[PDB]
Structures are given as C-alpha cells and as structure tokens.
Amino acid sequence: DRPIDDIVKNLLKFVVRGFYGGSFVLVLDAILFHSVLAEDDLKQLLSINKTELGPLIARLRSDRLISIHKQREERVYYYVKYPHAIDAIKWKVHQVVQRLKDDLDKNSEPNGYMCPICLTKYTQLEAVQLLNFDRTEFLCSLCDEPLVEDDSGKKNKEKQDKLNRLMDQIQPIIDSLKKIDDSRIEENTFEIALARLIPPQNQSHAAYTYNPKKGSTMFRPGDSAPEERENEKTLNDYYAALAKKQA
Template identity: 30%
Template sequence: MDLAVTLIKAVMRAFYSTRDILVVDALILHEALRDDDLAYLMAINTKDLHKICGKLREDRFLTVHTRSELRPGNPRPSNRTWYYINYRHTIDAIKWRVYNIDKEVQGTTVPVNEKKEYFCSFCKAEWTAMEVLDSVGPEGFLCHRCRRPLSFEADRNAGGHEQSTRLNDQFKFISELLPKIDAAHIPECDFDRALSKARPVVRDATHQRAATIPVDDGSSRPMAVRGLANVGPQSIAVNISTSDGPSEAEKEAERLRKEKIAQQNALPSWMSNSTITGESFSATAEAGSLGLSKEAAGGESKSNLVDNSATTQIDDIFEKIKAEQAAMLAREADAEDEEEEEEYEEEEEEDDEFEDVMATGDASRGEDSSDDRANKRVKVEETGAAKADSGNEDEEDEDELEFEDV
C-alpha cells in the first residue's frame, strides 16, 4: 500500500495543480471524506469542490459514493456525497495513460534525412538539409520563400528514438515503481472498507455540523427492492387432521363462503332478466339457489309483477304494430289488383280492332259452295293516312283489305 500511495503522490505533484494535490492528500490521510468535511479542510465551498473532484474522478484518482442519511428532527432522508480512493483503479489508470503516451511518441518516428532542422524566423517556413543545399548566401542557407537566412536547430522537431529517450527519462519515477507495485499485493478498496478506516474531521466551535444517521435502504443487497423490507409470511399455521376428507365444520364454512361470494357477484334484475318476457338469461337464477332470504324473495316477486305489467303493455304495442303492417300489406295488394285489371282492359281494347267479315262472290259460286265452305275471317285495317295518298296507293290498299277463299 505504501508503494501505491507513493506513486499517486508523485504523479499528482508532476502533472496536477496545488488544489488537486491537496484533495488527494486529504483523501489519502482520512481514507473517506464527505463533501462538506472535505470543503472545510480545503477552505472552499462545496460547489468549487465538486468541480475539482469531477476532474479527478474522470482521471480515476478518486471515487464518488452517494449515501442516504437522516438528520435528527427531519423525517425525510437526504443524499450525501462521499469521496474515497480506490487504489487498484487509480494504478490501472496511471498505467494506461503512460502506455498511450509512449505509443504516441514511438508512432511519430521520422527518418534523419526528413527532419526539418532549418526554419525561417520571418515566414515560419521549415526546410530539410536536402531542400536548402541549392540556396546558399553569404550568411548561410537562404529561405526559398522570402530569401532570408535560415536558423538551424537540431532538436527543433526531435522524434523517434530521441523523443522516446527523453520521455523515458521524465517518466523514470513511474517506470521504476510500476514493476514493484505489480509484485506487491494491493487490497481491494470499496466504500465500506474505506469508511471503516476513516479518520474523523476535527472542526472548530464555529463550524460544527449536525450529526447524521445512515439509512439502510437495501442498496447493499443486489436483489432488494426499496419499500419492500419484509415481504415474507408473518406466521405459519399447520392443522393436522385424522379424517380422510374435510370435516363438517369445514364444509359449512366453505358453503357460507360460496354463498357470500354469490351474493356479492349477483346481477340486478334489470340486467339478469329480459325486459320483454321477464325470463332470466341464465334460466337458473332463482332466489333459493342464491341463498336469499324470504324477504328478499318477496321483494323480487313484487318486482316481477311490475315487470309483467310492463311486458303486457309492450306486447299490446307490438300487436297494434303488426295489425297496421297487415292492413298496409292488404292495401298494397288491392292496388296491385287494380293495376292488373287496367292492363287487362287495355289489352281487350287492342283486340277489338280485329272484326269478322263475310266473304262475297258470284251467286253461282255461292250456291255451289254454301254448304261445303265456311266463311273466313278477314282482317280489316283502316288507316287514315292511306286514304290521303295518291290513286295508285289507294288501289294497292284495297287489294290488301279483302281476302277471299276461292
């Protein structure tokens, strides 16, 4: 543990500001501190302290824990913030950052012939030795852009092995401690262990704070549910009986329980019975089956009488409606019969246009064939328009008007 503390202090003093160093040193000394106690030691307000601790938390130099605490006289608990150091996480974060920096330095390796060692102080241009060989003046090499003399610095853009060597020299205090820490055992550090080893903060008389009591909300138990502290059975009763089945008392209690449930679930009469016929939809709803008393049965009979009177009135209304519908159907049938008679008379009128005409001829012919030959029916067609036509048309019409049997 001493090696881990030494490593953390060395890194904080090499790369962080004074306030950050003081916060980490206070946590190393006291193991675990609440935010108001740490702000008192730092002589700053809690808002500025949270900003500093937020940055250190991102860098994994401290860990934040929130706990519900109860003040005396206040029934509602409040969440308080605690800080402590998890040494394993902090050492791993330091290793990771050193590895990333070393990887970046090794990745920027530049060959010697490509190093830009000459630069112009006027236009800030940089050139390699091969690029300025053809531009030489009385004062040395000249810039190709502004023709001014160039300055030479060998370590201006040092890279590759040179930069890696300088990095190793600067990180030597870290690289020497890390192998020793890997060989030693660093115990696991969580909030409970840090709080058990915490040193109290001694305040002066003018900066005392009220004592608080932690609230056990079940957060330490992974499967606990807040608000359900005791969900198990309060008591267990076991009855041992020698009979094969339930006793008479149990049967009676079961029957009473079922009757009570049936009374609670029973539907009113206007819902269970038909409003037209008064019959029950289930056809089994009786007062006796539900275990009703005689008074309840009498009240139901009265309601049934009222329902029957209403039913008879509804039946009369339906009979009247049926009679009106029958009368309407009879009137429609009579109207259809009248229409059929009118159509029949029109057809008879059309048939009257045909008349019987007796055949005419010579007397001798009539005498010979009067007994053997019957008179024939000839269609006579009168057309008013034909009489107004020319003479030739009149002769053709007369030929068509009379037909005789010869």
C-alpha cells in the same frame, strides 16, 4: 497495513505533485490522510467552496482516480478506486511513452517542407513530386512558391533528451508500478474505506456508514468486480480486631 499500499499512496502524492495543481495535491493528500469524506466536511477543513471544488473533482473523475459515492442517510463520499486508478495511470503513461517514442521516431525522419504563403506543410515526398523542371528546387501547387525546408533536424536530439529526462523523472513511478505488478491488488470499495475510516472531525454532519437496500438490483459502472512505622500497622490491626469483634 501492507507497505505496498503505502507505496501506492506515496506514488499518488508524487504523481499529483509532479503533474497536477497544488489544489489537486491538497485535495488528494487530505482524502488519503483521511478516508471517504462528505463535501461539507471538506468545506470545513479547507474553507473552500463548490465553485473551487467543481473543476478539481471533475478532473479527478476524468482521470478515473477517485470514485464518488452517494448515499442517503443524500450524502456524498469519495474513495480512490485502486485498480481502475492504476489502470488509468498505466494507460496514460503507456500513451505518453508511445507518443513521445513515435515523436522521436518521426523527428528522426527528414523534416519536410512547407509553403508559408498558404501556411501548409509539405512532406519530403510531396516536395519530390512538386519539383521544378531544373531538378533543383520545389514549387508549390497553388501558391507557386519555392518550397522551404521544415526545421526539425536539430529538434531530434532535443526531443530525445526531453524523452530521456522525462523517463528519469517518471522512473520512480515505473519502479512503483513494478512493485505493484509484483504485488496483488485488492479493489477499493466505499465500505472498504469505511473499514479504514479516518475521522477528521468530531462534529461531522455525515453518518459515515453503509446502509444497504433489500429488494433492489440496481447496477452501475465504477462499482464492478466481476519502630514508629510498625506501630500504626499494629494499630491498624487493632482497629481490625475491634471491627471483627462487633461483627
């Protein structure tokens, strides 16, 4: 379909390949290669168990990546909610960016002190109020220990470089985010993934169909969108002339 959806899928592939386990890589690649899937079909394809499946599925629910669908035919299906997924990704990358930027801003500040007897850190101001009468060094309030300076000033450039190279690594995600913001997103549903059903098996137990309910108003989160060769020819005509004669 749209190449931006393909960019989204490849973005998911890159994100999991760069930030998550190989099992997560396999699971998300398989369920993007295919569509909504039953659990036993996954067990058949990957030859896996519920014990292995549990933490991975739980983590994917935690990052709000794949919406889990359940229906009675109960058969459990799984699909990537695109807007919630990209909003979670945007929130996480925004949080990472703000976290590391404030880390660099804080690491640009003076490092501070600590008293290693009580293993408690001390700020520069806390050192100022804890000085000696000599106006030279700083003594602890409880342990009465001469304050020793924190070691982060050399770490300032290290955290800056880690920030820089992490932005370099994350830059394709930024570009895909830019193209996504250029695009306009349609929200995934289970039946939308049914319309793009990609069957792995010809022996799957699950009926990958949606069966709606009348008389029901059940509302839940995660689902909200507010010559010789001439002779035989004449002989063939000879047969046809004789055949039409009897008729």
